[PDB]
DNA sequence: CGTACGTGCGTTTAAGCGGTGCTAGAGCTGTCTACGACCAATTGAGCGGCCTCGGCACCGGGATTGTGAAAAAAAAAAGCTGCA
């Protein structure tokens, strides 16, 4: 149930998080360097991507390991695929 | 392969120039004497000589440190799958 909401740069983080085959790795600057393939505002992109993550983390759908700016490490987790 | 650099635009900035006006201070002049050259006589600090004995160079033996191979683990990465 509940309210599903619209994200944008959010999408492009989760696209780019899965578009690396790894165990616990995705530092904001690695992500940005891939995803700077553009329609995007490259000048203001990092803040919005940085802003974007915190909320993904707070939902816990995206999962990370010990830090904040220092760690730069997370991936998609929980358990979501098409299912009953 | 990702981007830090070079290129070339238009916009902005202050260097450059020529000039005027003020005075700090560079430098020049003459005077006067404190201070350094020079001298000779005086004597002790430091030279060469020479003698010694203890630090230090060299050795052997025992302790310790670090390297490297070999065996075996932990992991990372590769090649291999069907699905969706
Ligand atoms: Ca580079
Ligand atoms: Ca003067
Ligand atoms: Ca001597």
UniProtKB/Swiss-Prot annotation:
It is found in: Nucleus; Chromosome. One of its GO terms (biological process) is positive regulation of transcription regulatory region DNA binding. The keyword Nucleus applies. Residues 5-78 form the H15 domain. Coiled coil: none annotated. Induction: Both the unedited and the RNA edited versions are induced by butyrate (at protein level). Only RNA edited version is induced by DTT, vinblastine or TNF (at protein level). GO terms for molecular function: chromatin DNA binding; double-stranded DNA binding; minor groove of adenine-thymine-rich DNA binding; nucleosomal DNA binding; nucleosome binding; RNA binding; structural constituent of chromatin. The modification Citrulline is found at residue 23. GO terms for cellular component: actin cytoskeleton; chromatin; euchromatin; Golgi apparatus; nuclear body; nucleoplasm; nucleosome; nucleus. Keywords: Acetylation, ADP-ribosylation, Chromosome, Citrullination, DNA-binding, Nucleus, Phosphoprotein. Belongs to the histone H1/H5 family. Histones H1 are necessary for the condensation of nucleosome chains into higher-order structures. The histones H1.0 are found in cells that are in terminal stages of differentiation or that have low rates of cell division. This is Histone H1.0. The chain holds residues 20 to 103 of 194 of the full protein.
């Amino acid at each position: 149930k509940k309210s599903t909401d619209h994200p944008k740069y959010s999408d492009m983080i989760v696209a780019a998080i899965q578009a690396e085959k790894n165990r616990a790795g995705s530092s904001r600057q690695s992500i940005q360097k891939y995803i700077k393939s553009h329609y995007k505002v490259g000048e203001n992109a990092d803040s919005q991507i940085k802003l974007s993550i915190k909320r993904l983390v707070t939902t816990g759908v995206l999962k990370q390991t010990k830090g904040v700016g220092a760690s730069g490490s997370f991936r998609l987790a929980k358990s979501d695929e098409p299912k009953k």
